[PDB]
Structures are given as C-alpha cells and as structure tokens.
Amino acid sequence: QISVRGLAGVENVTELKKNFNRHLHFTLVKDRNVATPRDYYFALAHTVRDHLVGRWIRTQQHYYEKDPKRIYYLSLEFYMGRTLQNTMVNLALENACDEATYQLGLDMEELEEIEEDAGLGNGGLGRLAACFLDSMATLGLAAYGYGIRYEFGIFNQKICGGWQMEEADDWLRYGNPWEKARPEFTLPVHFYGRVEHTSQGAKWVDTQVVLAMPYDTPVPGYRNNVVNTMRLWSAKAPNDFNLGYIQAVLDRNLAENISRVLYPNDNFFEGKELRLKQEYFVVAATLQDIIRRFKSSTNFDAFPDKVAIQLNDTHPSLAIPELMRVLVDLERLDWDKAWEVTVKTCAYTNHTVLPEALERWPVHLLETLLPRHLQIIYEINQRFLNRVAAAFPGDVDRLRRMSLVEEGAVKRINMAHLCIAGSHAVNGVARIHSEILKKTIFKDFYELEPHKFQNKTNGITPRRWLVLCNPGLAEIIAERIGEEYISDLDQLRKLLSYVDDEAFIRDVAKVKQENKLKFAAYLEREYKVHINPNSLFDVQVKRIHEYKRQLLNCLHVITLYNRIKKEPNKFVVPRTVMIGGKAAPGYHMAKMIIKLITAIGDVVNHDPVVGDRLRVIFLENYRVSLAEKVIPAADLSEQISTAGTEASGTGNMKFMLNGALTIGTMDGANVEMAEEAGEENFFIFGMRVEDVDRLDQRGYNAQEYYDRIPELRQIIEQLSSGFFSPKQPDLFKDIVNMLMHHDRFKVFADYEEYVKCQERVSALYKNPREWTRMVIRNIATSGKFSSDRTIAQYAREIWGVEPSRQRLPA
Amino acid sequence: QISVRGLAGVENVTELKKNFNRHLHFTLVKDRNVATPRDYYFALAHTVRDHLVGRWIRTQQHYYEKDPKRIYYLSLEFYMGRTLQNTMVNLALENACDEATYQLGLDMEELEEIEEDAGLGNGGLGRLAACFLDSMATLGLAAYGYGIRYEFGIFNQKICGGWQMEEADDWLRYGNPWEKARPEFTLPVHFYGRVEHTSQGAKWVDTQVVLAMPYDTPVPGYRNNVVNTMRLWSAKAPNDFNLGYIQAVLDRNLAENISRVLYPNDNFFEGKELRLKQEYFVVAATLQDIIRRFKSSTNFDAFPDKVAIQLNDTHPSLAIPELMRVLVDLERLDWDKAWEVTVKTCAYTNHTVLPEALERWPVHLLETLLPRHLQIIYEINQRFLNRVAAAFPGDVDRLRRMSLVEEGAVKRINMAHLCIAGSHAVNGVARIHSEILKKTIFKDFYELEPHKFQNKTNGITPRRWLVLCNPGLAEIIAERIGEEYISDLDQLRKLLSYVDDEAFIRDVAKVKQENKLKFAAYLEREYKVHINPNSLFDVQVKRIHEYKRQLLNCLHVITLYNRIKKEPNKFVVPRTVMIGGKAAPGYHMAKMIIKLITAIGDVVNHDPVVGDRLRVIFLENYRVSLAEKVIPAADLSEQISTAGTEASGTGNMKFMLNGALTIGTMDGANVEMAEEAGEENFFIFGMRVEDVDRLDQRGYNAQEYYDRIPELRQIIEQLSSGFFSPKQPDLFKDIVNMLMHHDRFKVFADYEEYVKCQERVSALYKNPREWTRMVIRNIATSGKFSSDRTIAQYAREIWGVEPSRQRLPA
Ligand SMILES: Cc1ccc(-c2nnc([C@@H]3O[C@H](CO)[C@@H](O)[C@H](O)[C@H]3O)[nH]2)cc1
Ligand SMILES: Cc1ccc(-c2nnc([C@@H]3O[C@H](CO)[C@@H](O)[C@H](O)[C@H]3O)[nH]2)cc1
Ligand SMILES: *Cc1c(COP(=O)(O)O)cnc(C)c1O
Ligand SMILES: *Cc1c(COP(=O)(O)O)cnc(C)c1O
C-alpha cells in the first residue's frame, strides 16, 4: 500500500501465511471454523514474534563476545503500550503482514485493536522509559531496561454519572505473547532481619527471603537487527515459606503482593511500606544480575568501565547503598574504593521539583525493613557532610540543608540528596528545568560539585509517534525527502523548502482532515458521541493535576459558552474541546476536576442555541493506545502548566510532530520547542518563571482578578450558584474555594492572557492556508525532540559510549 | 530397541529431530551452547505435544457432529503424575523419540526425570480418576474429566531428624506444557447472597461472584487416535472486585484462594468453609458447561439421554441440588420433572465406610454460603422421607436414620444420603465393599430401592502400570503372546501355558532382578543409601493411616530383628523392608508412625550383628513417579488393612501386574485377587470381616494378646522403655497407649497369624523356581483388574453407552 511500510514480496507473504496457519493450529489449538478475532490476533502475534527470535539470540551472543560497556536503565515504570505494530514497523514487516492477512480474509487493523496496552506506568515518566528503550536499540547500545512486572498496571478508567471509577487492569488475562519467563534465573531478595558485627565486617542475618523471577521482553531497534532486553521481575515465595498447613500456603500472597500492582500516583509521593518493598525488590534483583554478568566476562576497578546504571528519578535510589553493601560486606572492598566505584557507575535523572513528589522516607521504615542500608546511608551522610564542612567552613546552615537526614517530627531520608551524593552526573529533563535545579532546589550541591550537573532535554521516538500512529503524514514526508528521517529526525528541516509548495500544503491539510474523520468515526462507534469534523480540535490529554491546569482550560470553555449565549447570531470558529486523563484514586481535587469537565459538557452539549459551534468531550481511559489515535487528529495542543512546574512534558512533542499548533506557557520543553520553530509560529502566553516569583514575593491574591475581570466573576458566580449542577448547587464549592483562597498554581493570573491568545488561534484557523503553513514550520523543526538525539547525548556525555547506526547481520 | 515401544522409521526420526530443534530455538529461545537438560526436556515435550493437536481437534469435532451421549466424571482430585512418557506410549512414538534424542546426543530417560508430577490428588481416589480417564479414551467414550486446577498439589515430603516436614508443591513454577488455558470460556460462580421469593419462583440475589477459568489438558487413548479432555477450573476475581484502591486490588486473593491448594487429607473429612467453596466452585462451573453443550446440539426430557454425571464420592454432591436449581429456578421446569431428569442423569460412587471420612456439612455453613441450595436440600429431604413413610408406615426410627438432615448439637447434612436419594445408581468399588454398603451403612436405602445398588470393582491402567513402568516385563510377555493384551488384559491368561517353560521362568526372574538393580542404584544416587539387591524386597507403599496398619508391619520388623539378636548365627532369608507414604499434616498419630519407622531403621541398619540380613528404609516423598520405580522392583506387596476398612485398594493391583506376591488380609479387592489367582498362590492371613464383628461384639481387649504372646510383650516393653529412642525414652508413649487401650484397628489381633504367614513367604523365597512359578500364576490372572474392564462395566450398566475399540482416522 504505502512506501514506508516496507515490501510485500511473494515469498515473504507466502511464508507468513503458512506460519499464521501453523500457529492457529498448533499453538492456539483452534480450527478456522470456531476461531474468533482474538484467536486471529494471537496467531499473527506469534507469527511476528518468531521473526524476533534469531535476532534476539544473536544480539545477546554478540554482547557476550564483544563485551561492550553495558547500560542498565532502572525504572519502576515502563509504559510500553501495544507491541504488535511496533514490532512490524521495526522489522519492516508491516506491508507483508497486511498482504498476508488480507489474503486470509482478515483486516489487520481490526486484529491490532485486540491487543491490550502494557500499562506499567502512570504517564510521562513511564513513557519516557519506553521511548528510551526504543532509541537505545536503534542506536546499537548494549542496554537493558529493568523493572517490575506488575500483575495490574494503571487502572482502567470508567466514567459513571460524570465521575471517575477505577477498574483493575487485568492485562495478563489472555496471556502476553511478547514476554518469556526465565524461572531458571530466579534470585533471592532479603527483607527485615538485623545487623550483626563480627571480626570481619557486618552481616545481615535473620532475613525474610522473597524470590525475584525474571520475564524478558524483546526490544527491537529500527531496521538494524538489534534486539535488546527489558527484564521485569515478578515476586515469588520460597517453597518452605511459612513452612496450620493450609494457612501457610495461603499466606504466600504476603510475599507475592510486592509485584501485584502499580502505584497509580503521578508526580506524588505516597510513603507506604509496600512501595518501599517494590523499590528494594527491583534494585536488589537487578544488581545481582549486573554483577553476575560482570564476573562472567574480582577486579572491581574496571566495574565502571563495563557498567553504567541510570536511575530514573529517585525510585531506584536504593541502588546506591545496595551496591555499597555488596562491595563492602560481600566482596570485602574497603569503603573508599567501593564508593569510588559506586559514584562512577551511577547517574541520576530528576523529573520534578514539586515538593509533594519528592521521596523522603521515614527512618523508622528503613530501620525495620532495611537495617543494613540505613547504616550505610548514615555513613554516606557523615562522609559527605565532612566534605561540605571542609569546603564551606563554619556554614552550619548549609550542613543542615544538605544533609541526607532531615530532622523534625519524624526523621526522614531525602532520597534526592542521596542520589546526588552517590552519582557522577545529575541531570534535568529540559533546559529551563535543569537551570531551576541549579538555582533553587539543588543550589547547595551545584556549588559544591558544579561538574555533576547536566541537562538532557527529553524526546519521543519517531517510530511509535509518527510512523506507527500517522502513516499518512509519514508517507507524504517520505515522498519529498526519502525515508532516512525516521532514524535521523533532523532531516525534517528539509521540509522548510516546501512551505510555499501548493501541493505539499494541500497534502498536509488532507492528511489532518483524514485523521480527524477517522477519529470522529472512532468516537461514534466505541462511545456513541457525535462530533463535527470541520471544527477546530482543541485537545488537552495528560494526567489530571492542579499544576497542569485543566481548570484554566475549563474557564476558557465556559467563557466561549457565555460569549455565545450573549451574542448567539455572531459567527465564531467552531471548536471541539477534548480533555482526557486519569486522576490518582486518592486525589480528591483531581476527581472533582473530571466531574466539572463532564458537568460543563452536560450543559454545553445540549444547549440548542450553541448548535455544533462548541462541543466539550471528556475522553475516557486515556492511555498510550488512545494517544496514538487522538494526537494525529488534533489541531491545537494545550500545554498550559504554570511556568516552573512541568519539568519537560513529552505530549507536547508528540503533538508538534503530528501537525498540531501549540498554545502554551514558557514551561519545560515548550521553551525549546518555541526556540526551534520560532516564537511567531507558537501561541505563547502567560507568566514566565520570573513573573511567578515576583507574584509569590508580593503575595498572590486571587480576589484582585475576580474584582477586575467581569467575565471571570460571571464564571465563578455560575460555579458557586449551581448553574453547572442544578440538583446539587454546592457541588463545586471545593473548587471555587481553592481558586479564590489557596491556589498554588495561579489559574486566575494567566486567565486574561490565555483568553486573548485563544482568540489569535481562532483568527488563524479561519485562514486554512496560513494555518497549514505554520504547521509545516512546526513539523519541520521538530527534529531536536527525537529520543534518538536525547539518548546520543546520554551516551556521549554520561555513559561514555558511542552510538552506532550500523546493522547487525540478519 | 524393544518391540512394544513402536517403530523408529527414518522419516519419523528425521521429522522429530527438526521439530525438536525448532522448539528449542523458537519456543524456548535458547541455542545449544547454553541449553540445560531442563530446556531439552521442554523441547521434547513441545515436540510430542504437537502430535496430539490434530487428533484433539478432530476428536472434539467428531463428538460435535455425531452428538453421542457425553460422560462427565466430576472429581476434586486427579492424580495424573508425569505426562511425557504416557503420551509417547499412547501415540506409539517412544522408540522414534528415543532414536531422535539419541542422535542429538541426549539420553531420553534423563529428560523424562525432569518433568514434575501433576500431583492433584492424595492417593488412591485421585489416581483412580486418572486411570479412568485413560481407559475412557482407550474405549472411545465421549468423556470429560472436570476438576480444579490447584496451584499447589499434594505437598512434597522431606524427612528431617526422622520426622515428616511439608513443603509446598510449586508444580507450575517452570510452566505446564500440557495444559491450554481457555480464558474465552470463563464462567461466573455465585456465593453468599440471599433468596427472594417472587410471583414466579425463587431468585438468588446479592451474591459475590468468582470467575471460573478453564484449562484443558489432552487425554490420549491407546493407539486409537482419540484425545479426550480434562477441564480444570481456576478461580479469578472479577475486575470490579472490591471496586482504598491498592488494598482492593490486593484483596483479589480472597476470591482466588479457592483454587490455591489441595486439601491433603486421605480418607478424612475436614469441614472447613474453603473446602465447601472448592466443592461448589467445581460443580457450578461444570454444570453450566454441561448445559451449554447440551443446548448447542429447550426439551430437557432428552437430557439424561445425552448426559451422564458420575460423582466421585460425595465431594461433588452439590451437583444434585445445583442441577435442580438450574432446572427449577432458571429453566422453569416443574419440580417433579426436574427431579426425574436429575435422578436419571446422576450416579454416585462411594469409596469409604470409615465414619470420620464421611461428609456431613454443618447447616449453618450452607445457610450462609449457599442459601438456595439449603432450601432445595430441605425440599428433597421432605419428599424423600414422604416416600419412606409410605413404604414403611409407622417406622419412625427409619425416618430418623434415613433423613438427609442429622439432628444433634449442630444440625448437619449427610451428603451420602443426598447422593443416594438423587442418583439412579450407587456403587461400591469392590465386591466385599459393595456388600458391606448393603448390609450396614446404607442398609435402609437398599431396602427402599434395591435396584440402585451395584458393584464396580476398581482397576488400574495397564498402559501406565505395565508398559510404561516395566517395559522389560511387557516385552517378554509380548514375545510369547503378542501385543493385543495391552488393550485387552484378559489375554494374560495365555501365560498359564508357560508356567512350566524353563525359558519363561528364567526371563521373568531376570526382569525382576534387573528392576531391583536399577532401583537399588536409584536409591544410592538420589539418597546415598546402600541396599542388598539379593534380599527379598518387602514393600508397603500407600498413605500413612491407622487402618492401613503400617504399625503391624513395624511389629513384624522388630520381631525379625529380635529373633536375629537372639540367634545371630542362624540363617534367615535377607530382607529389605521398604515403607513409604505421606501423612496428612494434621494427623498426629500418622506422623508418629513415620517417626517410629525411621527410629527402627536407625537401630536396625546400624547393628553390626544384623549385617545386611535386614534393612529398613523409609521411602521419602512417595508419589506416582516413585510408584513407577518401586513397584516393578518389589518381591512382596503388603496389603494388610483390617478386614472391612480398605474399600478396594489399587496399589495391590499394581503390584500383582508387576510380579510381586501379595501378603494380605481378606479386605477390599484382595478378596477378588485371591479368587482370580487361586488362594494357594496368595499369602492370606488374619481376621475376616465376620471375625472382626465377633471381636467387637465381645469387646476387643489388647491386654489379652500382650499377656499370651511373649514376643509381642518384648516389643511393647522395648517401645515403652526407650530402646528405639534413647535420648527421649517416652517418645512413643502415645503409640503404646493407643495399641494397648484404644486401637480401633486391632493390630495385636492379627499379629500371630501375620508373623506365621511371613515365615511361609520366606520359605518360598528360598526356592527361586517355585517363587517365580507362583509369580507367573499371579501375573497371568491379573486381567480382571484392568480399568478397561471397570470402565466397560460403568458404560454398560450405569451410563448406557457402548465402548468401542475402533480407531479414528489419523
Ligand atoms: C510516583 C511518581 C510517578 C511519576 C513521577 C514523575 N515525576 N516527573 C514526572 C514527569 O516526568 C516526565 C519525563 O521526564 C516529564 O516530561 C514531566 O514534565 C514530569 O512531570 N513524573 C513522580 C513520582
Ligand atoms: C478428602 C478425601 C480424600 C479421599 C477419600 C477417599 N475415600 N476412599 C478413598 C480410597 O479410594 C480408592 C479408590 O476407590 C480405594 O481403592 C481405597 O480403598 C479408598 O481408601 N479415598 C476420602 C476423602
Ligand atoms: C506522552 C504521554 C504522557 C505525557 O503527557 P504530558 O502531556 O507530557 O504529561 C502521558 N500519558 C500518556 C498515555 C502518553 O502517551
Ligand atoms: C496406587 C497409588 C495409591 C493407592 O495405593 P493403595 O495401596 O491402594 O492405598 C496411592 N498413592 C499413589 C502415588 C499411587 O500410585
């Protein structure tokens, strides 16, 4: 069909067809007369999986022989989404499979919709790890992703009566064909116990043992025959566990609960024991695997030459004292030498400055669960603070501020401080964020060790986020500039020479229009909702949080509604406003925001005077597979966090690559996106970080904005009075109270500038040709935001390895 | 190599080799350089499994087209053991696989030892169900075995300091290649709730739902291309289960615990709620499956013509009121018509008369868990007792005795009475047992409905229990009489014409000798124990219970030891006494018996005066795979239960087929074995059932035997005084106290006759030729004890279907 999807050679199509029939018979144990679409999906998945196997074995053999430096990316979250299409894309099998399935009387697109997302993450941090794995494989790095195989990933969201309800995501119910259990490489992990001091060192004894069983998932690079591994650990009880008899066997669940469920908080710290166990479990199993592989190449001097460990935020921070434990207590290295090895091996990436997100563990939890680790952390702290004292003599407040141990009501360990002390590099995830780290939260550490601090601006993989989800756009681009841009996204700059080309302008607009029709159709089929495909598709999809300011969007929507009601017969550019995202189950304000959005829709969508000039839709169960559908369909990307709060953002980048214009604040990577595209090609509004600081210094008073802006006052009066909740007039009181008296994110402060900027958006949308030309300028300058660029920078500047675009032999 | 193992054709061997290599690469994702024996086992298992698939699909298609009467065998236990060799035997692939693996440089016998037993049973009842499945497939019956897929089967037994310790049997750790999950056929099962009475019938509402997910295992018949199904249900929570958030997901274990673990009691009733849930779970899921299949052929008149349900003891007895519930409450049949259908569909097999084994459920448990079922049971009881009253007017004690409801401190439902009332046939499992049922425990029911009561003497499958475990014996038999006896065991009678053939006599003795050498070698390798292969191998393997009288064996062993110590320089026939079996974890006396056996061994095995004339070995972790090793090696089979207590026995039959002579009481099937072989060819001793009754009538006084038998007094004094436990002199006080004052099984009463009979055994063993001739007379008359004979009788006399030995097309 289309060029970028690869060849459909007769030999290949014939072989795919016979292997499909083989799997259906021998693997699935079905005949064609009772097979369902799900059986057909599994037969295709097994057929494609067979093509990974040789490449996977050969890749891992190659690393064993060549013994390159290995990169270990430790994360509690890997938000992978679906695997079938991605695998076909990376192996150049998409057109062949399309042809094979077509000849068997099947629609491959229909079979793709059957696959469950692997939802082992909350949002941006989890999805970054997934893009990173794809880029590391594409760049030929000997890289391993290590995490937890949660039985239940991020919950499925249902909306009932306008409220979020949660259902367990039983993603493994039908089996996962992509993973391979490796019970033979099961490893013990220790908990509780006590420390004994002998003649020759400390000993951690009387521990409870939990087994870590690995499951391996292949990670194919783009057309280079490299297949790397993601290893996810599952918790198992030992067979003598608790060993009346029946109860002892039933109580195995206590141990196995460690890997049962993903904590569903985004940018929030919940200090529960089960979470700490998850964090140690992944670290302790992973480090034994790392050391085993290193010894199977005694002299730990060379450890940092053969191993890099990248900590995805502080969640795997226990890697630092665990590595020290192993080197000191088990390998009998002296402390100073062990510490040198540890620092040179470990690197830390920070993803947030929100105080409520930072991990600060109560000492009493660590004392009980991980008594030897607490001792090591204390020793690290004392040696570190001795260095601070020598560098800044007499500065006793600096000593208190920089300590790993926080004093107070309850004593806590600051895990970010631990990571900085024990890592040779510390990075933020966008230039403004990395600057914020050095100026504010980590200022003291930057002054002590300036060389540690780096920036690595985030990116997204153009395989999943262009070729897979938007083949139409990929195709019209390839027609002009060839296919090389898929693994070298900077080549999109060549498209600037087509900004005045009438044919290209038409094709870009046509692709968007087709994406919008397809999405409007998806809406009707799967959710019985009617939308106008000629309206401007105004989209804010991301987790629900106060800092992301879905509420500011809500205020604009009500403003548009009120302006229509005021002048019904005046023309306005029609909009479909789509907002989606999950709220953490315990986050009350986030749950109220969802209810407000559906409540606004109930009024707006049924007002006859509005007609189809304004629709407000809440997109249910936002997840990676839904992102792949809605992002190609969007016209306007809402990236409206308070300046200084969104560390980078990555949805922003996905929208830019897929032909939406952006309305946003100068926050996170939005700053760098506007710099790349030109500020004239971006809808920038609102306070900058410096303006937020100024307001905080004199004191934010929301009442002032209410008093001076009549359109804003009207909205608050509607909310308070029950306009959007007739049967429960006080339903939104908590929201109004927050906005008026304790809004940490200054929603009212950016309201006027936001509304004005939205008017400029609508004015440009009325001129299709100039809108499309601005889109082309965005797509053309999106190259910097490839995760291939990001990973090349980590490789060269942190890990000390050179990427390679060279193919392994098939 | 040997004839009965089938052909090793060049084409077949070539194809097996390439499929082995394919699975190793594509299925296991290994290369030969890092593969272990376990990987090789799995590659072979997948290769053999592929050969089942076509036959399985075609068999099930055939039943759909022909629509024969279907047989549903419901059991809480299926003790399957290993599957690889059995599958090769039944498909005629053993020699070909042996050759294929040999050419790849592998020893197939070594790979077979890697497979885990599927231990989903306790002992004889569970293993009967497994033999029955094999026979039903071999006889071409459209039969389905339905049970529970326990995550943990019967515990692994370790002996530590002479005591039993239990370890969980994590049999699924490495995967089960033989099962196929069928998540698409998941069905709901209801618990708790309450009954609502409407205008049109009762309604069971406000229930908790647990899902039943089926896993299907193929059951191949012997060389007939029939592959039937065993469907085992696994418990899953619904996705809105309990749906703060984290705890709700963790609490899914409450529902999933239903299928977690097999209750490890043999011939004992433990009235716990979890057990009742297991019993209802299997019944409720199974019956929906049965009805679905029946409707996919409205008129339930024909239900009993298309369906037979066989209840394996009372464990699945809730099938009776569940079928009534479905027909009355959901299909809206009138009561009388529903009852007619139910009675004609259901049949009940009793396996025990021990009072402590009979299921009598507290009414309060049923009231809470299964309130509609309790109502139906009450209604059944009232209608039944109205019939009893009409047949036996004025006999009010009969009404109390026959009631399904037992009055007392706690009200209970007698499940055996429920099964008799609701079944058209009731059978025992050996002639003497079936007579006991009619004379004692079920006398009142026999008087009301004599036509219901039948006998079906148990049997064992000669595939597993001769061809698989004793290929040497199978081969020398086949040389004389051909191969047809493997599916028509009565042909072994032809061997009587060889009882004076010197060549056959020599070959039978040689095969036994080779089996003994191989077992003696296994002992040394896996357990570091030294045994003399020229000694008489005296074996008692079976679950540990008072009624099986391992204690009587112990008394004989100590008698032999004491006689040697008394006259050290007198010749005695050397013996190796082997006792093995598991004790239920809560059964204190059974645990003490194990300790006594190991304690006797500690003394006897280390006395220099004894030398190698007497060894006592406790065989650890007795299970199906160990039975397959020890039974072919035995010379003497100990079948010494108190007359009237062992309903049938099936180990007895296994020993007879494999060339051991039997020392036993006239109990269970021992009676019929002696009748078949001739009493002169059996070592019969002890009280008959009538003698036990006589003793009970005048009162069993153990002191009398102690006073009159000096050899017995000496043993009791040794036990009491600490001879067998020097550091803990009173260790065996509970055992001595039981023997002297409350022995329900009359160990002392049979002691003298037992010792005398053992002397006759030893005298015959001194004459190898006559010993072997008696063995040939046993093997030759073992045909009746094929489970093919048993199943043909169930088919004709209970289920109303004709067996077929005709092959389906390959
Ligand atoms: C439990 C927990 C889960 C997630 C997080 C978390 N902290 N920052 C993020 C997000 O990380 C993305 C990738 O760099 C960023 O693009 C985004 O700006 C962050 O808010 N997530 C923090 C705690
Ligand atoms: C929980 C439970 C488990 C097993 C039993 C049970 N009742 N009889 C048996 C045994 O069933 C075999 C097969 O017919 C018989 O050969 C044997 O004689 C019985 O003791 N097991 C009873 C309860
Ligand atoms: C990219 C992505 C995110 C991150 O979106 P932001 O707007 O950067 O918060 C979250 N969830 C999903 C499913 C994504 O694909
Ligand atoms: C046959 C068998 C039994 C039954 O033995 P009995 O002597 O009849 O009690 C028990 N366990 C196993 C493993 C068996 O193979």
UniProtKB/Swiss-Prot annotation, chains A, B:
List of residues that carry N6-(pyridoxal phosphate)lysine: 654
EC code(s) of this entry: 2.4.1.1
Family matches, as PROSITE patterns: PHOSPHORYLASE (PS00102)
Binding of AMP, residues: 31, 64, 292-297
Site (Involved in the association of subunits): 97, 131
Modified residues (Phosphotyrosine): 192, 215, 446
A GO MF label: glycogen phosphorylase activity
Summary of activators and inhibitors of this protein: Allosterically regulated through the non-covalent binding of metabolites, being activated by AMP and inhibited by ATP, ADP, and glucose-6-phosphate. The activity is also controlled by post-translational modifications including phosphorylation.
UniProt function note: Allosteric enzyme that catalyzes the rate-limiting step in glycogen catabolism, the phosphorolytic cleavage of glycogen to produce glucose-1-phosphate, and plays a central role in maintaining cellular and organismal glucose homeostasis.
Protein name: Glycogen phosphorylase, muscle form
